[PDB]
Amino acid sequence: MQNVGFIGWRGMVGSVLMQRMVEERDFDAIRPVFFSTSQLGQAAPSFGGTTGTLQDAFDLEALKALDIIVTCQGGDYTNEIYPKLRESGWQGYWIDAASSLRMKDDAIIILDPVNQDVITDGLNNGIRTFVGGNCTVSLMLMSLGGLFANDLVDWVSVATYQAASGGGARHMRELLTQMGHLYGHVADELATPSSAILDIERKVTTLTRSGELPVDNFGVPLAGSLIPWIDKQLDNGQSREEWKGQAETNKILNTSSVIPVDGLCVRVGALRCHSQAFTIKLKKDVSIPTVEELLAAHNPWAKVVPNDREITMRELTPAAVTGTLTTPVGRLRKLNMGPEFLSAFTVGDQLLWGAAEPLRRMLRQLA
Amino acid sequence: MQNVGFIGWRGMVGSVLMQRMVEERDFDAIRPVFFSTSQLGQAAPSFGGTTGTLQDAFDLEALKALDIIVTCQGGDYTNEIYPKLRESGWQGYWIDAASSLRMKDDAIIILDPVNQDVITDGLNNGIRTFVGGNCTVSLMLMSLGGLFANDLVDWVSVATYQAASGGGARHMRELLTQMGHLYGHVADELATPSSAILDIERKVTTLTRSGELPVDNFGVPLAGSLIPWIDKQLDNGQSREEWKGQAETNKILNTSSVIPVDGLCVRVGALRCHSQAFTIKLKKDVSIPTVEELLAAHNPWAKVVPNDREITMRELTPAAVTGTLTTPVGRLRKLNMGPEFLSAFTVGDQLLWGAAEPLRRMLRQLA
């Protein structure tokens, strides 16, 4: 049995990972060791039917004793610990959810249902660092994997509807709380049938701009609004979120020719699901039936939602997808621009395939 | 003074119209006659100053007696009344918010800041029917008018984030009520700092699918979600909202060559503002500072928000636009696919330029 250490397993992403591992009984085949900074010496979570004690996440000697490290602790932690281990000669496997190491030449971005070939090769070539890809790119490739796998993509233009979970636990609470303020502010008139909507809307619009809304985490209001800018501004005018699309998609698929991927990343009032609108340029005129076939064939999670009104409203929404491993694709049809212009709308839970799932699957291969 | 008849001036769109006409004192240069389907014969509102009474909206004689008819009543009304009045020989002016007559050869889609030239031509070529354009297209053109005016657009791919006001006053109340349900369901947990975010989320996700959420108007939940399908399903796999994109843009602009306009229309948890993400292909490599100048110079409502993080967060959002006449454009830059690819994000109030404002302005041109 491999000695696998877990860091940040009590965080939001870490908690989902634990849930998933318990659910898949991933703890049976390994010897889990839980790390922390707080309740040291105190009994481990015992998820792995283990009766051990919590280790010091910053004790290098304890980390070096591991065969595999799985962290959902974050970039600050990865940035402090990873180089110390590598430089100390540690050659165990490092599985990470943080973006820190994604673009390193000795690290592979993991999304096995999409790039197991890249993973296996790297494995056979000494790569011992596997990093999960950005939630947006990860969900996109899980849904449109069949198109890429068949080398049908010339370029991709995206428009996202990103969930608060991408920001974090505090962000999600902030979104729900604002929903509370907005409704509570007009609770009575909403209960009065004769009340005028313009009177109701007037009050909520005013409250939204008043400054009373709790916006510590997002900076500005999210409930009833949206924010067309996700994280750091770059010189080319992209936000770091938009920049990842091309960099990560191409590194994951391990392309030879760069596939242009760009668009606008928008934060919306959803909790865990990221929905994406696509304008995909195909290299050849492929029929929609053929397209639906390739897509559905790539993996079991890419559920193709027929392009019909009723079923779309039922299945292609955050409401239908939250908490599930399904990454549906719908609204597939050709755009007026031409037979080579394809439209697609995807939805996917940010914390599963967009965060914890890829990590869980990789450990399994190393177990 | 022209005798102007108002139909459905008590509905939501009609109420905004009445509010705007009062703000600009548009009732002074006209003889307003207020109609109703409800109680007739009763006194008229004092917005018009008149000491008149409410007439019968279905009384063809009373309607024939007018010089101009401004109705926010709806397609059903229009489909019955309009053809009758036209058949009885009525040549007065008919200003409609409903989409019914938009594509008639004897009608012009009005958005004067964008196509005044066309409104004047038809106004000289015997056109007596002017209809407001689809909220999505009106707003797009108000923000992106500069690029179109200068004939720089090859095609346009859109991904919209549409507000509930587009659906109606019931839809807006439904959205807000849903926010109340979601929050109330986890009100206590949110108030408990120590509560687990995943428990809070699990509760909300289950409630959303419980069927306990009032969804009479949108069919499925909207709060915390989104619906990638708006209105009737067309045979080309396009929804009617998506179909209006190319149909209305070209008629409004009265193009000599069809400009392809297509994409996905999505309903989101917003009250009055429609936001839209664009991938615009330009006919020629134009610089961003230029594009910025062309857009800002087309009309005073097309505010160009610099492609910078802080201001974008504060100025290019529904929170910053609801209730104003401003139709901002931001996130302008070249996409990875090439220098002829322009990205743009716009926000606009659905009830003003998207509904009431074009009518008010047209009426003012005929007084």
Side-chain angles (χ1 to χ4, degrees):
Chain A
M1 271 197 321
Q2 296 299 287
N3 300 111
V4 187
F6 295 86
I7 305 336
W9 52 280
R10 298 196 209 73
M12 185 173 52
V13 176
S15 302
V16 169
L17 175 62
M18 300 301 244
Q19 284 166 35
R20 288 292 300 137
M21 288 189 277
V22 160
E23 194 181 318
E24 302 294 315
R25 54 278 170 189
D26 292 328
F27 286 110
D28 302 327
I30 59 169
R31 186 295 187 91
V33 184
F34 301 91
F35 283 73
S36 183
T37 65
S38 175
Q39 304 183 309
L40 298 177
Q42 292 188 53
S46 57
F47 300 139
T50 181
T51 55
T53 52
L54 305 181
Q55 298 298 298
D56 180 15
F58 288 94
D59 178 349
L60 301 180
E61 302 318 307
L63 293 176
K64 295 178 180 177
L66 302 167
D67 297 310
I68 307 176
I69 291 181
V70 182
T71 49
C72 298
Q73 187 56 36
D76 290 315
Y77 178 80
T78 295
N79 296 320
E80 185 187 316
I81 294 54
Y82 186 77
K84 288 182 173 54
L85 285 180
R86 285 311 184 206
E87 290 178 8
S88 77
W90 184 70
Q91 302 192 306
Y93 291 100
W94 180 277
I95 296 168
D96 206 336
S99 67
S100 303
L101 310 173
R102 295 184 183 158
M103 311 309 299
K104 297 293 184 179
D105 295 315
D106 63 329
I108 286 268
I109 301 186
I110 58 176
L111 183 52
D112 78 278
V114 169
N115 80 331
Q116 175 66 231
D117 57 301
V118 180
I119 297 179
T120 43
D121 286 37
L123 231 26
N124 290 315
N125 298 310
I127 299 182
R128 317 278 243 182
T129 304
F130 299 93
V131 191
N134 206 61
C135 53
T136 59
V137 175
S138 178
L139 295 181
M140 169 188 79
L141 290 178
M142 279 301 291
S143 293
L144 311 176
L147 288 174
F148 286 93
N150 284 291
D151 185 47
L152 304 179
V153 182
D154 225 46
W155 59 250
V156 181
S157 190
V158 198
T160 74
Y161 303 66
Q162 294 177 63
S165 62
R170 316 226 305 97
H171 298 65
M172 290 165 79
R173 289 206 181 204
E174 182 170 292
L175 170 61
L176 282 168
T177 295
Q178 306 188 331
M179 291 201 156
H181 283 267
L182 302 191
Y183 165 74
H185 191 57
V186 173
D188 298 311
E189 33 278 287
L190 276 179
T192 299
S194 63
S195 69
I197 17 328
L198 297 190
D199 285 310
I200 290 166
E201 170 273 306
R202 192 178 178 182
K203 292 177 60 180
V204 302
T205 293
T206 298
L207 171 62
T208 301
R209 287 188 197 109
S210 75
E212 297 184 53
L213 245 51
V215 303
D216 298 280
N217 300 291
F218 283 118
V220 300
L222 181 58
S225 191
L226 49 76
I227 313 171
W229 199 302
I230 308 10
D231 107 336
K232 266 306 76 201
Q233 180 174 329
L234 291 324
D235 263 309
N236 58 178
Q238 282 187 308
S239 66
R240 191 156 54 196
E241 274 293 282
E242 282 145 24
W243 178 88
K244 288 177 179 169
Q246 191 168 296
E248 290 188 40
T249 296
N250 285 287
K251 177 166 182 172
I252 285 173
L253 298 176
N254 183 48
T255 57
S256 46
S257 301
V258 175
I259 293 298
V261 178
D262 212 341
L264 304 166
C265 293
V266 182
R267 191 118 266 153
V268 302
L271 277 185
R272 287 174 51 149
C273 277
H274 285 354
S275 307
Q276 306 189 62
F278 298 100
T279 297
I280 312 161
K281 211 289 179 178
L282 306 177
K283 294 198 280 200
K284 289 170 176 290
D285 182 331
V286 175
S287 71
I288 281 160
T290 295
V291 171
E292 308 186 314
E293 286 180 60
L294 302 176
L295 288 175
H298 187 287
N299 70 79
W301 299 286
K303 174 179 71 180
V304 173
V305 180
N307 192 199
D308 301 293
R309 184 163 178 290
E310 293 70 45
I311 189 170
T312 293
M313 294 170 60
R314 289 197 306 275
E315 325 204 306
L316 203 68
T317 77
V321 179
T322 301
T324 74
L325 294 166
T326 314
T327 64
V329 200
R331 303 312 274 71
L332 295 167
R333 73 194 168 65
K334 298 301 179 61
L335 297 164
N336 300 339
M337 352 286 224
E340 302 182 311
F341 293 76
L342 172 74
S343 67
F345 194 80
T346 61
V347 182
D349 184 283
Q350 187 273 325
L351 291 168
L352 291 168
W353 283 113
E357 200 60 27
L359 309 192
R360 172 195 162 271
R361 324 255 303 162
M362 191 65 214
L363 179 58
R364 264 286 181 180
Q365 300 188 188
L366 301 179
Chain B
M1 286 187 279
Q2 298 297 290
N3 301 87
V4 186
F6 292 99
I7 305 300
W9 53 285
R10 8 180 50 174
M12 186 174 68
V13 174
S15 293
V16 172
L17 178 55
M18 299 303 294
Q19 182 190 306
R20 286 292 294 130
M21 290 192 276
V22 173
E23 275 164 44
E24 304 306 319
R25 285 190 165 187
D26 295 347
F27 288 116
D28 305 329
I30 66 174
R31 305 187 179 185
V33 186
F34 299 90
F35 288 72
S36 113
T37 62
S38 175
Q39 276 181 302
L40 38 64
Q42 313 181 305
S46 67
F47 321 136
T50 307
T51 61
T53 63
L54 306 177
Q55 302 302 300
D56 188 310
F58 297 106
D59 186 332
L60 293 182
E61 296 189 305
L63 297 179
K64 294 174 186 175
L66 304 162
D67 295 315
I68 304 172
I69 294 173
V70 182
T71 75
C72 297
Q73 187 68 328
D76 287 332
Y77 184 77
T78 292
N79 298 315
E80 162 167 37
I81 299 303
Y82 182 71
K84 286 194 173 190
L85 297 177
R86 291 309 191 194
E87 275 296 61
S88 78
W90 190 70
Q91 301 177 303
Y93 283 110
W94 175 277
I95 295 84
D96 210 344
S99 54
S100 300
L101 310 163
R102 289 182 185 161
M103 309 311 280
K104 302 301 178 182
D105 300 290
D106 66 304
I108 291 300
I109 302 295
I110 53 167
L111 187 63
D112 73 278
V114 174
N115 70 342
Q116 180 53 236
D117 60 301
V118 176
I119 293 41
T120 288
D121 284 41
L123 211 44
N124 289 326
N125 295 299
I127 294 303
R128 301 289 214 296
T129 302
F130 302 92
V131 197
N134 203 54
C135 43
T136 49
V137 188
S138 291
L139 294 183
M140 166 182 79
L141 290 179
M142 283 302 293
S143 292
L144 307 184
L147 302 179
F148 282 103
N150 301 298
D151 186 58
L152 284 167
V153 182
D154 246 54
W155 52 257
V156 178
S157 192
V158 185
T160 72
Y161 304 63
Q162 298 178 53
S165 71
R170 304 213 305 182
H171 295 60
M172 297 169 74
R173 298 178 69 115
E174 181 168 295
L175 175 66
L176 286 172
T177 293
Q178 272 169 23
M179 294 186 163
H181 276 59
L182 297 184
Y183 166 91
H185 189 52
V186 296
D188 289 325
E189 293 87 320
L190 283 167
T192 310
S194 64
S195 58
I197 189 59
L198 295 176
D199 290 323
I200 296 69
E201 174 269 304
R202 190 183 313 130
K203 288 290 188 176
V204 179
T205 299
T206 63
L207 173 57
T208 302
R209 291 178 198 145
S210 61
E212 289 174 44
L213 279 186
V215 299
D216 297 282
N217 298 289
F218 284 113
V220 292
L222 182 57
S225 192
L226 49 73
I227 310 168
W229 200 298
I230 307 206
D231 166 300
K232 271 287 68 191
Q233 184 178 335
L234 266 290
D235 299 298
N236 59 183
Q238 188 174 53
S239 74
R240 185 151 59 184
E241 270 283 289
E242 285 154 24
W243 177 85
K244 298 181 180 183
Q246 184 171 297
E248 294 187 44
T249 293
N250 283 293
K251 176 160 186 176
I252 284 172
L253 296 178
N254 181 50
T255 57
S256 59
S257 313
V258 173
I259 303 176
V261 178
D262 213 354
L264 303 167
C265 290
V266 189
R267 189 115 271 160
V268 304
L271 272 191
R272 285 181 54 161
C273 289
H274 284 352
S275 299
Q276 313 179 64
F278 302 98
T279 291
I280 303 302
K281 185 176 186 177
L282 307 171
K283 293 185 174 182
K284 51 193 67 176
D285 179 331
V286 192
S287 79
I288 283 336
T290 296
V291 170
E292 278 180 47
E293 292 186 53
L294 304 185
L295 290 174
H298 180 285
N299 70 84
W301 298 283
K303 174 171 87 168
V304 170
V305 181
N307 186 207
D308 299 286
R309 198 162 177 293
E310 284 66 54
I311 20 152
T312 293
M313 293 182 66
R314 301 183 304 236
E315 291 181 44
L316 202 63
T317 68
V321 180
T322 299
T324 80
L325 281 157
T326 320
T327 59
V329 202
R331 301 308 278 77
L332 296 151
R333 68 191 175 73
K334 295 305 178 61
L335 299 179
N336 280 332
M337 20 271 226
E340 294 195 307
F341 292 78
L342 174 71
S343 64
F345 194 81
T346 65
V347 185
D349 183 280
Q350 190 276 325
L351 290 178
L352 291 166
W353 286 111
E357 206 63 27
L359 316 184
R360 178 197 149 267
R361 324 241 307 162
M362 190 61 232
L363 170 69
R364 196 165 178 168
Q365 291 188 189
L366 306 171

